[PDB]
Write an enzyme that holds these catalytic residues in place. Sequence first.
Site, PDB file in Angstrom:
ATOM      1  N   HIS A 281       0.872  -1.245   0.000  1.00 55.63           N
ATOM      2  CA  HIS A 281       0.000   0.000   0.000  1.00 55.63           C
ATOM      3  C   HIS A 281       0.861   1.229   0.000  1.00 55.63           C
ATOM      4  O   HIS A 281       0.551   2.223  -0.646  1.00 55.63           O
ATOM      5  CB  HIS A 281      -0.921   0.033   1.238  1.00 55.63           C
ATOM      6  CG  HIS A 281      -1.660  -1.250   1.468  1.00 55.63           C
ATOM      7  ND1 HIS A 281      -2.625  -1.693   0.589  1.00 55.63           N
ATOM      8  CD2 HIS A 281      -1.601  -2.182   2.491  1.00 55.63           C
ATOM      9  CE1 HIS A 281      -3.137  -2.864   1.038  1.00 55.63           C
ATOM     10  NE2 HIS A 281      -2.511  -3.185   2.177  1.00 55.63           N
TER      11      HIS A 281
ATOM     12  N   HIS B 197       5.221   6.878   6.878  1.00 57.97           N
ATOM     13  CA  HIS B 197       4.957   6.561   5.523  1.00 57.97           C
ATOM     14  C   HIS B 197       4.380   7.785   4.840  1.00 57.97           C
ATOM     15  O   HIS B 197       4.166   8.832   5.449  1.00 57.97           O
ATOM     16  CB  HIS B 197       3.973   5.375   5.400  1.00 57.97           C
ATOM     17  CG  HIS B 197       2.642   5.735   6.046  1.00 57.97           C
ATOM     18  ND1 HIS B 197       2.448   5.591   7.390  1.00 57.97           N
ATOM     19  CD2 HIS B 197       1.485   6.317   5.519  1.00 57.97           C
ATOM     20  CE1 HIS B 197       1.182   6.071   7.661  1.00 57.97           C
ATOM     21  NE2 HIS B 197       0.624   6.498   6.506  1.00 57.97           N
TER      22      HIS B 197
ATOM     23  N   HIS C  85       1.678   9.107   1.396  1.00 61.16           N
ATOM     24  CA  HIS C  85       0.697   8.941   0.386  1.00 61.16           C
ATOM     25  C   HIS C  85       1.011   9.896  -0.726  1.00 61.16           C
ATOM     26  O   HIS C  85       1.347  11.078  -0.456  1.00 61.16           O
ATOM     27  CB  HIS C  85      -0.742   9.229   0.916  1.00 61.16           C
ATOM     28  CG  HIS C  85      -1.077   8.474   2.173  1.00 61.16           C
ATOM     29  ND1 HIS C  85      -1.774   7.295   2.139  1.00 61.16           N
ATOM     30  CD2 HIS C  85      -0.809   8.736   3.543  1.00 61.16           C
ATOM     31  CE1 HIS C  85      -1.960   6.853   3.400  1.00 61.16           C
ATOM     32  NE2 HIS C  85      -1.321   7.674   4.258  1.00 61.16           N
TER      33      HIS C  85
ATOM     34  N   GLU D 271      -3.860  13.417   1.307  1.00 62.67           N
ATOM     35  CA  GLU D 271      -5.120  12.928   1.906  1.00 62.67           C
ATOM     36  C   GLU D 271      -5.886  14.111   2.481  1.00 62.67           C
ATOM     37  O   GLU D 271      -6.980  14.377   2.082  1.00 62.67           O
ATOM     38  CB  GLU D 271      -4.774  11.864   2.971  1.00 62.67           C
ATOM     39  CG  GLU D 271      -4.154  10.618   2.350  1.00 62.67           C
ATOM     40  CD  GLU D 271      -4.363   9.371   3.108  1.00 62.67           C
ATOM     41  OE1 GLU D 271      -4.017   9.305   4.262  1.00 62.67           O
ATOM     42  OE2 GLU D 271      -4.837   8.384   2.497  1.00 62.67           O
TER      43      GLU D 271
ATOM     44  N   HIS E  60       3.018  10.934   6.976  1.00 63.72           N
ATOM     45  CA  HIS E  60       2.382  10.641   8.239  1.00 63.72           C
ATOM     46  C   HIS E  60       3.376  10.030   9.179  1.00 63.72           C
ATOM     47  O   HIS E  60       3.870   8.897   8.895  1.00 63.72           O
ATOM     48  CB  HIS E  60       1.259   9.635   7.994  1.00 63.72           C
ATOM     49  CG  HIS E  60       0.092  10.239   7.258  1.00 63.72           C
ATOM     50  ND1 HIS E  60      -0.922   9.515   6.618  1.00 63.72           N
ATOM     51  CD2 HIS E  60      -0.227  11.547   7.089  1.00 63.72           C
ATOM     52  CE1 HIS E  60      -1.763  10.335   6.109  1.00 63.72           C
ATOM     53  NE2 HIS E  60      -1.378  11.599   6.393  1.00 63.72           N
TER      54      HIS E  60
ATOM     55  N   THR F 113      -6.486   6.298   8.044  1.00 64.11           N
ATOM     56  CA  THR F 113      -6.992   6.556   6.648  1.00 64.11           C
ATOM     57  C   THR F 113      -6.876   5.378   5.777  1.00 64.11           C
ATOM     58  O   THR F 113      -7.264   5.456   4.639  1.00 64.11           O
ATOM     59  CB  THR F 113      -6.233   7.698   5.954  1.00 64.11           C
ATOM     60  OG1 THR F 113      -4.890   7.310   5.753  1.00 64.11           O
ATOM     61  CG2 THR F 113      -6.340   9.023   6.860  1.00 64.11           C
ATOM     62  N   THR F 114      -6.426   4.248   6.325  1.00 61.42           N
ATOM     63  CA  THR F 114      -6.502   2.930   5.613  1.00 61.42           C
ATOM     64  C   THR F 114      -7.298   1.966   6.490  1.00 61.42           C
ATOM     65  O   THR F 114      -7.403   2.149   7.707  1.00 61.42           O
ATOM     66  CB  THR F 114      -5.093   2.316   5.423  1.00 61.42           C
ATOM     67  OG1 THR F 114      -4.468   1.986   6.677  1.00 61.42           O
ATOM     68  CG2 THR F 114      -4.166   3.197   4.626  1.00 61.42           C
TER      69      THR F 114
HETATM   70 ZN   LIG Z   1      -1.062   7.516   6.268  1.00 58.98          ZN
END
Ligand SMILES: [Zn+2]
Length: 258
Positions: A62, A92, A94, A104, A117, A196-197
């Site tokens: 992911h 990590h 996004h 996000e 994040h 958020t996942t």
């Molecule tokens: Zn995240």
Amino acid sequence: HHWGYGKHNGPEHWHKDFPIAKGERQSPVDIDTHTAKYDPSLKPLSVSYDQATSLRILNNGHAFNVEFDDSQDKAVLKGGPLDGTYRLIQFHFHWGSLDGQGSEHTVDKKKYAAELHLVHWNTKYGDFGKAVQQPDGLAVLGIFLKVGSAKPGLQKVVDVLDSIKTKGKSADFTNFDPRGLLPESLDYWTYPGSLTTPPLLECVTWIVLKEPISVSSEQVLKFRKLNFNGEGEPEELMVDNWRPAQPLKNRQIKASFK
Ligand SMILES: [Zn+2]
């Protein structure tokens, strides 16, 4: 048919395995800068990363996670809106397929190229797995990325991505200093939200810095060469691994700054 970011398994499908997807405190959200209220009671944020011990970097299908030793109070976040001490476990990003999307959280509907994040857990709950079951379990520090000048402190991450191209691959990643990923200002917005996942747990105090960091086009292009798939599977470039903004519902976003 597990969750992901594609047409058939992306954010708009997650609710079917994770009904909390349609919950009352989901993340990310749009930050409407005119509606966010300055809260003079908010404290400066305390980011104590001097003793951080990075260990490993992992492509988990992911994103990629840079993992830290969280077996003692080394790298901690406190202050801000937080009561107590929160330990850094991993960071990590996004990011998008193109510079015009990837974040996000959004700011007055503006999408940034990417969003970092830094994920921390409340030491009063003893481990991460217990912390994610509590409303005040996690504190996630969110930092926007825009494309411009290179971020020198990011390059060590960029240059290892080659060795973790595909899902399930990992590499030794010691001695990385995450202070190199911070912007100058620690001005922030804060609101109660979620992962958020999946599993989308409603366990996060979000702290989103106002000042983006700049990274280079070459840096973000290297993010975009990673793969969602595992070795020797059809190549699916790891891009657009962001969830869009979710309804704010009965929540207030608070600013640390006037
Ligand atoms: Zn995240």
